[PDB]
Design a protein around this ligand. Structure first.
Ligand SMILES: [Mn+2]
Ligand SMILES: [Mn+2]
Ligand SMILES: [Mn+2]
Lengths: 498, 498, 498
């Protein structure tokens, strides 16, 4: 059912004819054996298709050429069962659009001390065949990945599997379409940037439909379709008295529903995966989309507030990326602090748009709905608490000449006293290593007030993403120390400054 | 005896023409003591020749003129006795083509508290005088190693001699001559490169003589001389049943012996110090040089397989580097692996060519050969085990615009079982910090399958080597971590990308 | 029959739906009309295949994806009949392996002053639609070409056609295989270099077979096949008395013939397009290949003397490139000068290997054959004079970090007195602007003694090649003036020094 099922990774084996052609026939036995046992037992994010052996230049070019042409081909994992003169690969590697991982593995785990002979020695020579390959890729500054490990090693499966994840994320982004409903909040910098650069670098496109284009779909929906969706609320969520049938703010639940249907139909018919809104342009909408934006985020779409295409895009990438994983992933603003010796905290939220995928409960749908901001009707919104434990918050910023991705490892924690006046969903966390330093470093390194929160993905996941896209990663966890942190900033600046 | 008897290090001393033939003659006295003290007591790689005092610019410029012209001057060791304003050193240091080391030292291991005068402070004042000199070395951006200590210091003797050792290596490489017998294995990358560039940088030359040429010399050796060498094989090694008289492959031993004599004679007359071969071009040679190659490696000749001049030269270099040290140093190629929790191992070896320099025993010689590779006669070889202990493998790769020296720290270990069918000698080691990262880090950095294995030389030797040549040293050892390693590869790329 | 017939160029029209879909239908009428009239009447180097209109992002990605996959697709020529929002093209353009030329043309030549209206105005808006496209390509630093001109403009056809030429040259080079028969003349720099860099940058591969591998094929040929080829000589060429049946050097014509057959069979069975020899390794050959190398160059193969793969490669590229053109293209060494007020000259040649494609006559096959060099039998060689008029000489050199292509516009001229002792073919020329300055500049800018001479190609042809491959071109013709010439060298050095 998932987008992972719309891709497969190619298992290419490198060798040469020198010994052959029955020395090849063993190689093929191994490959087919390792491919089946992985597809069967290694619980990897998507499928491995074994291609015919690459033992000549033309065979290797062929495979890369094919890999570029096949839209499901998300990456290559190459095993060099033997020596494989690396010049053979050059012409293929210079046309390759798809990512590559060397699986520096071997058929046997134990070296058969008592039996080993030259036949053996000259078969399963990945020990050196993998190093010849290492070189050309390094020589070309072509970022190839490596996992060393025996082919049944479950630790390897993970790192292999974790890489397959990024391959698919990289190709989905190459089709991701953000639909903004208006422009950036006036006078705001971070949420602005060069959209051309984004689509060049990342392949996702951002383009603006009039709020009025939406309003038209938003107004067109049938009551039959509205009251249907109104039922799915009462089913799913705790309705606060104000929200119930005879409640003075029932009518506002109707307007929420339609804005959900309206946005969903516009977004499906447009073929979109993400979107923005701006409270400075809600002409023809009854209320700022809250409930609707929250549920569309649960249903999968990327979103960010006030025109913020980068963060909205990012959310969608990290959701997709998170498929099959234990948690969350939500848009998030760092809203307010709690200061105390030992217990410094952040509380995250926005005006309304907090995704219910990181919640732990059955979730109230109250109004208590004054939003002076926007200047519209009291909006519907889901109110909830965020799950505990170790998360991350990611901010992608545009330094103008390049992008930088900041990640701050964090730990959600339970609110000690509850928030009875606060009509928004919360997320409360301690920022590794500690607020003052965590905040300082983030601020030092730019990094928006807009972030993507996530329980399901982590730092190592994001490190591979940063690699896969060739961008700087600015990491802020417990190891962070400002003198070193600053040096890195400088040294990365020169490096990525080409 | 050995090549360290060819070279010398000059012992220059720095003061000003002002003032006091006493003071200025009084200083001459100490340099004559420390030098004589060091030359009999210190056990340094080669002698220290004291030179007349650098008091004026012209004298320093002369000292440099001579130091450049004198082909056994391996470098200057400089100690700044009184105080020698560095503007005097300019014209000299500017022309100085031989390496320099500031031995930053005093007269006198401790301090006269009641016996201190201005007459004393006039003369012998390296504390400040030494610093001024570092400045100009830094300003001009020259190397200038510095060792600080009291001359009588055991630790400081050690430090200076290791430098002296490198200084001499630098000079020997200048005259090093590789001789290639055929070209690279077809379609191979790591072992190709720009010979012109290497000769510019390190000064070693690489030029190829026809396989046909060698054959002419091999086909010329007298049966008398051939037989005589075999008498040396009987006495050196453990001749296997087939190897000895009435042996089924006794002639293969003679042919090997003939080859070795021809190859030797050839190399000697052409004044060569290293060589390569290629199994793809052996026309006129009865079998692929194995035993011949091994004993020649053991006698001091650098070599590396299938046309690999870089590694071949590096072997010769490191072999000379290691002179007067306990331990082996060999050509080596990661051949296969043993994956076992806690005990990941690499079996090193080559087709035939491994140096008995690194062996534990009196070596067995066998034929049990059938080398499918090439397609020649069952060739002779020395089978043996590699010693137990700390070692390094090193590779010099050409990245197009610059060279990179990779060195992995390792620890060789007893084969836990005999290897009865392995027709070749072996090395066996655990890689620091562990196989997967050891291997992965090397692949990320490129780094040949061909390496120079050494028991005698260490990371520190190679560190100075890399500094001495201004090449990047990539270091894989117990302290390695992939995030910092990767960072260093990027931050170095832009440093040395100049 | 020619390799041009194995490729086609794609004619892609960019537009958008804004007006459509019958506004598109006109666009298609135009495109089909312009494609037919060009394929019919424009005598272009190869075929134009009109692809379906690109009016959306997915359609544009599709076309580029297809262009990469189709091996005959040599380049794209895009016409922007209307405005074509350039973001649509980004994702296609970021995957494109093939070269692109914008044909900034229009359907009508004259603006129909009296009739023009908005319908018209908004159709045929290439005036601005072409500038939107210009931008993205410029923004991406993607070297796209442009010819502006009406679509019937014959001057345009040329510049379009001239570009199509380079597209095909660029793809052939991506399959060109040099087969060296040995290594570089010892101690020679220019002919040496980094073969990995070449195959990366250019896609042609260079790899060394043993002279003995050839000798085996060289010796295997049948007399029936030898004497057959001996007849084709007497037919084609003037046989000097020494060369005739009872001539004392007839036997040497037999050995020439076999070396021709032998080299031709080895080269066809290897699938090669170019080759080198080295006189320092002719073990098993009767005489240095002269006659044979000359005729194989006429038949099409690239060649250069003494191991020189770059120049041999280049020759083959410039021959292929020259298909369908008036002249020549030959390997060439600048052999000797004539100095005289007003009449300074160069005479070009090699020991033997001068291609008879630039000759004007029926061509003597004498021996007068002492070649002390090589140390072999008196060789057969064709002796001839070169055609008059404006030519070029191209040298591709490896500056180590990058390549530079030098071109010197020259003018062949008739020898005033004849060369009765000189047993080699001549080419005599004046080097624009004049020997002293022409020689100086060439020497200043490096540039080998080995060149490719050519009557058929020129400077503008080579300028597009240099562009198509992104390398420096150092031009030396009449406009050349050393102060400016030097400045350019410096300014290009910084630019291409990334
Ligand atoms: Mn906000
Ligand atoms: Mn090898
Ligand atoms: Mn020549």
């Amino acid at each position: 059912m998932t987008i992972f099922d719309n891709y497969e990774v190619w298992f290419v084996i490198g060798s040469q004819h020198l010994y052959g052609p029955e020395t090849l026939r063993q190689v093929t036995q191994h490959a087919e054996h390792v491919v089946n046992a992985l597809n069967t037992e290694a619980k990897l994010p998507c499928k491995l298709v074994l291609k015919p052996l690459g033992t000549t230049p033309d065979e290797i070019t062929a495979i890369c050429r094919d890999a570029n042409y096949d839209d499901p081909c998300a990456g290559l994992v190459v095993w060099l069962h033997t020596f494989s003169p690396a010049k053979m690969w050059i012409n293929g590697l210079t046309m390759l659009n798809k990512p590559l991982l060397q699986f520096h593995t071997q058929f046997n785990a134990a070296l058969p001390w008592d039996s080993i002979d030259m036949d053996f020695m000259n078969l399963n020579q990945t020990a050196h065949g993998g190093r010849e390959f290492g070189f050309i890729g390094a020589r070309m500054r072509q970022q190839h990945a490596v996992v060393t490990g025996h082919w049944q090693d479950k630790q390897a499966h993970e790192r292999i599997g974790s890489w397959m994840r990024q391959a698919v994320s990289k190709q989905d982004t190459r089709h991701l379409k953000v639909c903004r409903f208006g422009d950036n909040m006036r006078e705001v910098a971070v949420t602005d940037g060069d959209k051309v650069a984004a689509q060049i670098k990342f392949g996702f496109s951002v383009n603006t439909w009039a709020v009025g284009d939406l309003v038209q779909v938003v107004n067109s929906i049938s009551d039959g379709d509205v009251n249907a969706l109104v039922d799915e609320y009462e089913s799913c969520y705790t309705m606060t008295p104000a929200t119930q049938i005879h409640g003075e703010k029932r009518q506002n639940v109707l307007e929420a529903a339609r804005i959900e249907l309206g946005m969903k139909r516009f977004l499906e018919q447009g073929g979109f995966h993400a979107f923005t809104t701006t409270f400075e342009d809600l002409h023809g909408l009854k209320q700022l989309p809250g409930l609707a934006v929250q549920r569309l985020m649960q249903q999968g779409y990327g979103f960010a507030g006030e025109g913020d295409w980068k963060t909205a895009a990012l959310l969608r990438i990290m959701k997709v990326m998170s498929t099959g994983l234990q948690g969350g992933t939500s848009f998030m603003e760092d809203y307010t602090y709690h200061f105390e010796k030992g217990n410094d905290l952040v509380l995250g939220s926005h005006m309304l748009e907090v995704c219910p995928s990181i919640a732990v409960e059955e979730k109230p749908i109250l109004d208590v709905q004054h939003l002076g901001i926007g200047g519209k009707d009291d909006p519907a919104r889901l109110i909830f608490n965020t799950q505990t434990g170790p998360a991350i918050v990611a901010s992608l910023i545009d330094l103008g000449d390049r992008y930088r991705l900041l990640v701050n490892c964090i730990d959600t924690v339970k609110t000690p006293h509850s928030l009875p006046k606060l009509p928004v969903a919360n997320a409360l966390w301690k920022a590794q290593p500690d607020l003052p330093t965590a905040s300082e470093a983030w601020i030092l390194a730019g990094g928006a007030h807009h972030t993507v929160f996530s329980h399901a993905l982590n730092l190592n996941d994001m490190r591979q993403f940063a690699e896969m896209h060739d961008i700087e990663i600015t990491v802020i966890d417990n190891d962070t120390r400002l003198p070193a942190f600053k040096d890195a900033l400088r040294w990365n600046e020169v490096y990525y400054g080409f």
